[PDB]
């Protein structure tokens, strides 16, 4: 119920394979190259993680707490406000481990360092504890 959704059974194993389901598709494109396979699958991952966790606020269902979760986004309400629980940090280590493989692949370029890193800082800046209720100029 959006406070216990990433701490159920088998949500981690179905989150790793969703990256592989995204990567084996994007590696299977004719007019593309393998640097802009791992460049492309890093933007699509960190855009979904920023739109499904840091923009959508509320529940798809109707919470019987009279909408106490209405103003808070989905990151701010995992496991009822505690920060470093067992499954909140796994969603922070995972864009890092993807970033290292996209660092070994693409062979350490310039403008792909421009595009991969600022898409990697764009998912980690709101994941700090000292940026909990702040919404900067929007939403």
């Amino acid at each position: 119920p959006n406070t216990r959704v990433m701490n159920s059974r088998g949500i981690w194993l179905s989150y790793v394979l969703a990256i592989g389901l995204l990567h084996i598709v994007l590696l299977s494109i004719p007019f593309v190259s393998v640097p802009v396979v791992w460049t492309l699958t890093n933007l699509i991952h960190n855009m979904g993680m920023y739109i499904f966790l840091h923009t959508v606020k509320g529940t798809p269902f109707e919470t019987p707490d009279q909408g106490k979760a209405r103003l808070l986004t989905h990151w701010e309400q995992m496991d009822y406000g505690v920060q470093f629980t067992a499954s909140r940090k796994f969603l922070t280590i995972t864009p890092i481990v993807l970033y290292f493989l996209t660092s070994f692949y693409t062979k350490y370029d310039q403008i792909h360092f421009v595009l991969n890193t600022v898409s990697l800082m764009s998912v980690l800046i709101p994941k700090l504890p000292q940026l909990h209720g702040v919404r900067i100029f929007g939403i």
Binding site: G81, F84, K89, K107
Partner: peptide, 28 residues
């Protein structure tokens, strides 16, 4: 191979960010 200028420095920050992140254990 093995040597960009201002990238392994930034990759060296995040690999030390994880070990801090793996040991925090608590909040409100």
């Amino acid at each position: 191979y093995e040597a960009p200028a201002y990238h392994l420095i930034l990759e060296g920050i995040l690999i030390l960010w994880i070990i801090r992140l793996l040991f925090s254990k608590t909040y409100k």
